[PDB]
From a paper:
Dihydroxy acid dehydratase ([name]) is the third enzyme in the plant branched-chain amino acid biosynthetic pathway and the target for commercial herbicide development. Our structural and kinetic analysis of the mutant AthDHADs has validated the hypothesis that larger hydrophobic amino acids surrounding the active-site entrance enhance resistance to AA.
To determine if small-to-large amino acid mutations at these hydrophobic residues can decrease active site volume and increase resistance to AA, we generated multiple mutations at V496, V497, and I177 in [name] followed by kinetic and structural characterizations. The substitutions of V496L and V497I may push the loop where G490 is located toward the center of the channel. To probe the acquired resistance mechanism of [name] mutants, we determined the crystal of [name]–I177F (2.45 Å), [name]–V178W (1.77 Å), [name]–V496W (1.59 Å), and [name]–[name] (1.87 Å). The overall structures of the [name] mutants I177F, V178W, V496W, and [name] displayed high similarity with the wild-type [name], with the RMSD of 0.123 Å (888 core Cα atoms), 0.275 Å (994 core Cα atoms), 0.142 Å (1,034 core Cα atoms), and 0.283 Å (994 core Cα atoms), respectively. The obvious difference was in loop 490–497, which forms the side wall at the narrowest point of the substrate channel. In the [name] structure, the benzene ring of F497 induces F495 to rotate about 53° which change the shape of loop 489–493 and make it close to the V178 at the channel entrance. As a result, this mutant also affects the accession of AA to the active site.
Residue numbers in the entry:
A (entry chain A), B (entry chain B): 4 to 12, 17 to 168, 213 to 574
Amino acid sequence: SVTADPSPPNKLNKYSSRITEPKSQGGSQAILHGVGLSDDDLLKPQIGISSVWYEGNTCNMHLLKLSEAVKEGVENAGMVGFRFNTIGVSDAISMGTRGMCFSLQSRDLIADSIETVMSAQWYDGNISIPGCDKNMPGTIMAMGRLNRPGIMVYGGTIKPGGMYTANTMASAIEAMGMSLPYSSSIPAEDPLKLDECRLAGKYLLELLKMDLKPRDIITPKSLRNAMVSVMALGGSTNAVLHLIAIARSVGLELTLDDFQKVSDAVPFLADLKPSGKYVMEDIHKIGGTPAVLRYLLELGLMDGDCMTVTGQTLAQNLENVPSLTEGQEIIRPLSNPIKETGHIQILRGDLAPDGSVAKITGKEGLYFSGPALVFEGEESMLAAISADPMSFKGTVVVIRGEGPKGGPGMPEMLTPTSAIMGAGLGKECALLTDGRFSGGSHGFVFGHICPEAQEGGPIGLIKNGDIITIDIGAARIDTQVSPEEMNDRRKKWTAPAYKVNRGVLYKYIKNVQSASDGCVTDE
Amino acid sequence: SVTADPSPPNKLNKYSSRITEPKSQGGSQAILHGVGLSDDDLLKPQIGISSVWYEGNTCNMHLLKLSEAVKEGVENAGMVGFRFNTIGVSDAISMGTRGMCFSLQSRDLIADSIETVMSAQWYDGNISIPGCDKNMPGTIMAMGRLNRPGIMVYGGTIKPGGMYTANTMASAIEAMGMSLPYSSSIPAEDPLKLDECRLAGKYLLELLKMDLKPRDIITPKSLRNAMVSVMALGGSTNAVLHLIAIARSVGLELTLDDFQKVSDAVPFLADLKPSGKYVMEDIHKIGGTPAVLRYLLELGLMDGDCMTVTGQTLAQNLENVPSLTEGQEIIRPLSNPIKETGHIQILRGDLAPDGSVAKITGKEGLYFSGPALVFEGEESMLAAISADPMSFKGTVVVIRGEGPKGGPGMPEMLTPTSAIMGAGLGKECALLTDGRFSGGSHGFVFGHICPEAQEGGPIGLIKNGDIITIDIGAARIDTQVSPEEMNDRRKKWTAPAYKVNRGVLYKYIKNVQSASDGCVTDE
Ligand code: FES
Ligand code: FES
């Protein structure tokens, strides 16, 4: 099925032998001697160590230190380590600006970057070190494409001075068996994080011996395990995009309806910010992600037979770990969940026929109806609510043209919800977008609406005054406009000009699939 | 024309003010304090320092040290430096393997990478530090897209224990005014290279004060200056691909015929490997690239009025620099050139209607004719010459399916010429490809043939036995087969399946333009 990267020419150096053994590759051997390899080093496995260090983010500035520890442990395990580094960007910096147009796509750029180096240099395995920014799914996608043994070492969340995207994905990737136990919950710069770094080489050596590859570890069942952790912990709706992209990277299928089925089957149990009170460090103090997953596995919610990067199954990893600390108030018992099903909800209906994603707490009621108030981008919406906030009362606010192609880049938006809260309009309107809304968003806020306006989806045909009725029980975002009149509007509609004609965002427009398809770019 | 990256909201912090000044961006300011910025620091320009450090190549493993020096100089010039790093790959490692399919595209990946970080973080200027691998044009393309003040600090060529792509592009980019004087000729790890690093911030500060941007420096005339250095130094045919890509990045036009015109107008003067005897370090010892360019300008071959990253014109930079050392034998006088015109030749004809590129020394005669010997890739060609070398005598060897889409990745090939040389067949056959042959290639060796075979170009219609006649004076690669019979073949031809269906190379297939178009990917 998936055909992307070179095949190997059992041996632990299945790939690097392509350039270390035949003499026809003497030029390769000469460079390797030049970078410090001895004759005996040429026989060893070669590990690409890919960090996402950069200085403009607290979540990434210390990752070179972690990458050094990883290399030391790779050497202490009898292998050769080759460090390299790719880009990443900070949403806390770019939030509220057109810089956010470059954020989501950097995930796919990172996947391309790591795939490129691993393929060109013939490395046998990968250890990736993403920070607590949001691009780490990119490292897993690269490993799925290559299908060489790999481990993701989460850089760690910063201690306080929330289950946003980074904590959501780190936890989910640990649940999926691609990070070592506790990787997601040990804080950044904790001494145990450095120790994890120094042990990744030992574990990867064993995966090379077993030839336990990413497509042996990432399976329909381990993908479900990842989704279970998202639902139980209240994780971010961005997980829909990222877990779909990860599933596609290994040649598997994952749809919006798979997310609904897991959501319906898993209660929301974790009293964690943004919805709740506690943060990832509090999880760390009561037994960490392994304790949480042990509990979910004991409740029968997880498949324990899935292989992991420990070289053992999830159940074998969790059998021994300390359980959640007696008396802890963070993870609710199954009898008293924060919500009986998951926060993440898939909705269709007239205006989102190919899907949409919401975070529903169960506290906001089942219906909203109002006349549409339509904005062609975040900027006009913010201006209108500044000049005339009362015009928003009772409306269904539509911020369109913010999808993967229309944005471009499917930017995450935070100011619209803040402005609505600040104007006292929180329970008095609903919000629709073909883009995304930040992690503090919940209730009658719907993102990822497909097809996006740029593609002529119904969201692009809404007019001011159209009566929109959102029904959470029926999972529908409907319009009072007749289907015939919306077809009339579709016939008279023409795509707006793209906002760019060059550069990385124009390539994204040329390559990106819909949000319901995880915005994958390589299909 | 070019619309790619965010516009600024005179001030030296034209871009970073978007996030450092507004109270609406308090979250940006909080991260900036978190990474170490004081209140006063928030008023300073912010410089993105993008290195291409990685450990699997001698040409790149020491660039973090250079990046630290660049940051120190940025601070010593009253600005804030933010270091980040992107990927790169080694052709010496991957030569002869399918890993080479990932090499050329990493140029475009690096441009996307640097563009992404600069755009998302709102940096005011860029200092890029590529190594002596081959991807440095990517850094210039990113600067062209952004059109923010920028300087390329060449990492330097390694001292001996050649005018290949890296030296060709470093020299050409210095000639085009986007590197400081001597950047291309100071050896890697020379003390003066570290000093250059520590001065880049001083120079960039002045460019911010003048607002002297990449599109003010990269112009039709400075592009011609770059091409002049390529012809005079005997630089690599790869410069055709990279200078076109750089020209497109600033919204300019540059065609194959432009290269022919400069080639016809500029003699080959430099006795430098691969064609000649000396190496870049020998240039360094007789006055460096500025001394070479000073001579070329005195001969009237260069435009001295072009602005450069010194904040002055090329003529102003070169007026003072020491001239070529008295008695040096490396750079020939104009009266005794190694070749009266440049090595780089554009050829069309029946089999390359959209162009092709050759390195012609003038020592190989004007014609070759022989029956075609056709291979669908490098591997089959190498096998045939191993089993039956005499079957190659007198033929025109065709290695097709090695273009941007067919390869995929337009890999550079070295073993075919080596095998031909080793079999004693060097003057006794010709070589055609839609891919590329390495820098040791010259004479009746023709690359970049367009349209490529994957695209149904005539090269994909050749059959064994077809009489192919190459005429260097007429600049034609012709076939004895009638145009009508070639149309008969085209009508019965169907494109082969792509060799990949996922990953970064499938995206390259989806995005890449022809070699005659510089293999740009963002149009
Ligand atoms: S920017 Fe790193 S997680 Fe918000
Ligand atoms: S690999 Fe760096 S220039 Fe040849």
